[PDB]
C-alpha cells in the first residue's frame, strides 16, 4: 500500500476526552502509518495535521517544506488535549476558510480526513452543513472516520449525503484503525489523479 499521486491530504484529529491519552497515541500512530504509505512531497502528496477541540491547533501545514521523516516526527508528538468538546464544525470552518482559502494546486485532489470520536453541542453545529457545502464547492472531499461509540453519526451521515465521494468509515474503536488503514489509504489514493 503506497500512494504516489497528486493529493493534498488534511488530517483532522478529535482532541476531546472521548479518546483517552493512550487511545489518542493510537490515533497519532495511525496518522504516522498513513504518512508512511503516501509519497509525501510538495510534488506528490502534501499533508496537514490539525488537532481540534473548541478551537484547533495546526501542527503541519500543506506548504511546510520539511523532510517526510520530520513531518512524521511532528505528528508523533502532537499534544493530547482531552477537551470536553471537539467542534467538527469549527475545524471544517478552519479547513474551508484558512487551509483552502486559496486553491494552490488545482492539479491535486483535496481531502479532509475527519477523525471523529465525539459529538459537539448542537449550537456549535448551526453552520455545519454550510461548511460542508462550502468545501464541496472548492472540491475538497470530506472523509469522515467515526471512532468509538460517541462519534457523531448524524454528522457522518450528513457528510456522506452532501457529495457522492464523501464516503464514511465507521470504526468501533481506535484499535480498528490499524486494520482498516490500507483500505482507507487505497480509497483516498483513488480519488487523486496520477502525475503526468
Amino acid at each position, epitope marked *: 500500500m503506497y500512494c504516489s499521486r497528486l493529493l493534498d491530504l488534511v488530517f483532522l484529529l478529535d482532541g476531546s476526552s472521548r479518546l483517552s491519552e493512550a487511545e489518542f497515541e493510537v490515533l497519532k500512530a495511525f496518522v504516522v502509518d498513513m504518512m508512511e504509505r503516501l509519497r509525501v512531497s510538495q510534488k506528490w502528496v502534501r499533508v496537514a495535521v490539525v488537532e481540534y477541540h473548541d478551537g484547533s491547533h495546526a501542527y503541519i501545514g500543506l506548504k511546510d517544506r520539511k523532510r517526510p521523516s520530520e513531518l512524521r516526527r511532528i505528528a508523533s508528538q502532537v499534544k493530547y488535549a482531552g477537551s470536553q468538546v471537539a467542534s467538527t464544525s469549527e475545524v471544517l470552518k478552519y479547513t474551508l476558510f484558512q487551509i483552502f482559502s486559496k486553491i494552490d494546486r488545482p492539479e491535486a485532489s483535496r481531502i479532509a480526513l475527519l477523525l471523529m470520536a465525539s459529538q459537539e*453541542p*448542537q*449550537r456549535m453545529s*448551526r*453552520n455545519f*452543513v454550510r461548511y460542508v457545502q462550502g468545501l464541496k464547492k472548492k472540491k475538497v472531499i470530506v472523509i469522515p472516520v467515526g471512532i468509538g461509540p460517541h462519534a457523531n453519526l*448524524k454528522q457522518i451521515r*450528513l457528510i456522506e449525503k452532501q457529495a457522492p465521494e464523501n464516503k464514511a468509515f465507521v470504526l468501533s474503536s481506535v484499535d480498528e484503525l490499524e486494520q482498516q488503514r490500507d483500505e482507507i489509504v487505497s480509497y483516498l489514493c483513488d480519488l487523486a489523479p496520477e502525475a503526468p
Partner: antibody
Framework: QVQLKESGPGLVAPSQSLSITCTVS????????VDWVRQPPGKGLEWLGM???????DYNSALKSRLSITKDNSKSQVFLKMNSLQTDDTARYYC????????????????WGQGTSVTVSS | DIQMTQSPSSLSASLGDRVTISCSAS??????LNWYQQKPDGAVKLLIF???SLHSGVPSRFSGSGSGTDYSLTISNLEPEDIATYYC?????????FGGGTKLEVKR
C-alpha cells in the same frame, strides 16, 4: 396542535430580574428549539436568543450577557431569566418554537406564543 | 448584525388588490429570509420560510420571492383578514434580525 404560552410577572422594578415561564404542548422540547422575541410598545421585533433540543443556547449579544434560557424537558417548560432590567426592556415578550434542524439549516420561528407584557418601572 | 430594511412602513390598498411588500438586506443573505404576519390584535404567525415556502395553513394567495439582498412578499388578492403588519427576517447570520415592518391600511 403546537402551542406555547408565557407566564410572566407583569411588572419589574428597574435593576431587578425578569423571569418568564413558557409552557408548551403538541411537541417535545427534546426535538425542537424554543426562542424568545420581544417587542417594545409601538416598535418592531427583536430576536433575543434560543435553546436547542440538547439544552445548548444562542444569545443575542445586544443583551450584554444578561440573558439565561434553561428548560425542563419533562415538564414541557422553558425558562427565560434576564438580569437587571431597565426601562428600555419594557416590551411584550414571546416564546416561539423553531425546528432547530441544522441538517436542513431550518430555524424558522414557526409557532408563536401570544406573548406577555412586561413593564419596567418604579 | 445584518440590517433589514422595509422601505414602506405604511402601505395603502383596496380589498381585491394585488399587494407587494418589499424587504432588503444590507448584504447577500442567500435566500435565508422568512416573512411573518402580525395582526392588529397582536397575534404573530409565520407565513413564508426560506424565501418562498408556504407554512402550514397559509393560503396560496401569499407567495414570496427574491435572492441576494432583495425579497418580496406578494398577496395576489387582498382579503379583509390580511390587514396586518408584515415583517421580513434574515437567518444568514446570528443574531437573527427583522425588517421594521409594513402595515397595510384600507383605502377609502
Amino acid at each position: 396542535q403546537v402551542q406555547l404560552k408565557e407566564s410572566g410577572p407583569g411588572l419589574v422594578a428597574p435593576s431587578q430580574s425578569l423571569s418568564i415561564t413558557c409552557t408548551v404542548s403538541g411537541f417535545s422540547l427534546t426535538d425542537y428549539g424554543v426562542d424568545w422575541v420581544r417587542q417594545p410598545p409601538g416598535k418592531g421585533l427583536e430576536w433575543l436568543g434560543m435553546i436547542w433540543g440538547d439544552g445548548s443556547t444562542d444569545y443575542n449579544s445586544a443583551l450584554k450577557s444578561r440573558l439565561s434560557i434553561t428548560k425542563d424537558n419533562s415538564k414541557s417548560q422553558v425558562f427565560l431569566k434576564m438580569n437587571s432590567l431597565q426601562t428600555d426592556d419594557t416590551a411584550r415578550y414571546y416564546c416561539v418554537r423553531d425546528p432547530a434542524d441544522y441538517g436542513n439549516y431550518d430555524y424558522a420561528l414557526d409557532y408563536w406564543g401570544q406573548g406577555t407584557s412586561v413593564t419596567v418601572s418604579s | 448584525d445584518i440590517q433589514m430594511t422595509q422601505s414602506p412602513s405604511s402601505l395603502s390598498a383596496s380589498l381585491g388588490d394585488r399587494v407587494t411588500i418589499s424587504c432588503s438586506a444590507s448584504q447577500d443573505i442567500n435566500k435565508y429570509l422568512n416573512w411573518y404576519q402580525q395582526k392588529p390584535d397582536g397575534a404573530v404567525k409565520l407565513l413564508i420560510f426560506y424565501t418562498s415556502s408556504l407554512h402550514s395553513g397559509v393560503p396560496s394567495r401569499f407567495s414570496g420571492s427574491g435572492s441576494g439582498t432583495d425579497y418580496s412578499l406578494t398577496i395576489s388578492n387582498l382579503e379583509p383578514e390580511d390587514i396586518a403588519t408584515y415583517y421580513c427576517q434574515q437567518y444568514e447570520k446570528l443574531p437573527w434580525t427583522f425588517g421594521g415592518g409594513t402595515k397595510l391600511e384600507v383605502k377609502r
